[PDB]
């Protein structure tokens, strides 16, 4: 029933959704999500925040939503998923376009 978290999906922002770092996290109980920008703490605000959009049982699909980002937001983004059973960690390179998407 209970299990360690697993980041089954983490990719660079797509053409249709340029301001979102997409992810899929599995875990039981709900894993705590934490981001790192080039190894440094990413303090979440109204400009850069985590939002899980679809919650299907032990599956969590969401984005690191960025509001009007520039080249100053480009870099290495590490997502860490933890619960009391384990830890999973995956990283991506992000390059942000000046338009939301197509």
């Amino acid at each position: 029933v209970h299990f360690a978290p697993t980041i089954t999906f983490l990719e660079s922002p797509t053409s249709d959704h340029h301001w979102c770092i997409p992810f899929t996290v599995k875990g039981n109980p709900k894993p705590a999500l934490q981001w790192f920008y080039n190894g440094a703490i990413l303090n979440e605000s109204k400009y850069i925040c985590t939002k899980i959009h679809v919650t299907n049982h032990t599956e969590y699909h969401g984005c690191l939503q960025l509001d009007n980002p520039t080249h100053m937001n480009n870099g290495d983004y590490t997502l860490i998923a933890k619960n009391e059973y384990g830890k999973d960690e995956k990283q991506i390179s992000a390059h942000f376009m000046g338009w939301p998407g197509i």
């Epitope: 934490q34 440094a40 703490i41 303090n43 830890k87 960690e89 990283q91």
Partner: antibody
Framework: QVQLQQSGAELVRPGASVTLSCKAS????????MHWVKQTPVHGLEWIGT????????AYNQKFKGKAILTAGKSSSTAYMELRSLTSEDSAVYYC?????????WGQGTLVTVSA | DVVMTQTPLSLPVSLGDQASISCRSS???????????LHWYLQKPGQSPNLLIY???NRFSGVPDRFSGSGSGTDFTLKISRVEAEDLGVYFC?????????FGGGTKLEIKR
């Protein structure tokens, strides 16, 4: 501004105990891991243990078990490390550091001199 | 306990040249989650250690292009292309894979003159 502010230098007599503090600011202290590191010229850098301030859950290096005790003030945003039954082997610079497997944030260090 | 052997202990290198620090683990640093938690730090005299590279090759925010890391499993390297005066200090390797987390002995960078 992520800042780890450590308490001042301590001069403690052998056999006594000292409590070292580390004020964390510029982030949500309770959401991240806190680590303590010891530096000596002979042994170099040694990892003491780690605390998760939300759950108060600890993990220690076997060689610091019973010597060091890690606690966290949740409302105060402060990490504490107690050093018991002090010896000359406990005279070192102690560092509070975070916030994951890599240590991007370090305090200025606390010098602990163990002498009569 | 994982032993981190750093070689050499002292590294003499002329200004503008390249320095090469080696860190050797006693056990594989690949975690079950798939990550290799090998980090590099620089401790300038009188100061607290500073992070240079996290997870074998990733440069920490603000670290110059000149610093680069490589390796896998047990053998690892730190390279500083075109060494500067501010690069002076002790270079440490660290592992965050196995508990207790361990640090290497340190490599003191020396400017040859």
């Amino acid at each position: 501004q992520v800042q780890l502010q450590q308490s001042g230098a301590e001069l403690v007599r052998p056999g006594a105990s000292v409590t070292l503090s580390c004020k964390a600011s510029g982030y949500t202290f309770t959401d991240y891991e806190m680590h303590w590191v010891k530096q000596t010229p002979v042994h170099g850098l040694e990892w003491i243990g780690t605390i998760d301030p939300e759950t108060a859950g600890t993990a220690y290096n076997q060689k610091f078990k019973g010597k060091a005790i890690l606690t966290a003030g949740k409302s105060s945003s402060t990490a504490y490390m107690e050093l018991r039954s002090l010896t000359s082997e406990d005279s070192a610079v102690y560092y509070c550091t975070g916030v994951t497997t890599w240590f991007a944030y370090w305090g200025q260090g606390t010098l602990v001199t163990v002498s009569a | 306990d994982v032993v981190m052997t750093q070689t050499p202990l002292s590294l003499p290198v002329s200004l503008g040249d390249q320095a090469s620090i080696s860190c050797r683990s006693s056990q594989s640093l690949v975690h079950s989650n798939g990550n290799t938690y090998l980090h590099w730090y620089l401790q300038k005299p009188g100061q607290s250690p500073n992070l240079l590279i996290y997870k074998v090759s990733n440069r920490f925010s603000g670290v110059p292009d000149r610093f680069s890391g490589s390796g896998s499993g047990t053998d690892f390297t730190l390279k500083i292309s075109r060494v500067e005066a501010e690069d002076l200090g002790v270079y440490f390797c660290s592992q965050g894979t196995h508990v207790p987390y361990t640090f290497g002995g340190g490599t003191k960078l020396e400017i040859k003159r």
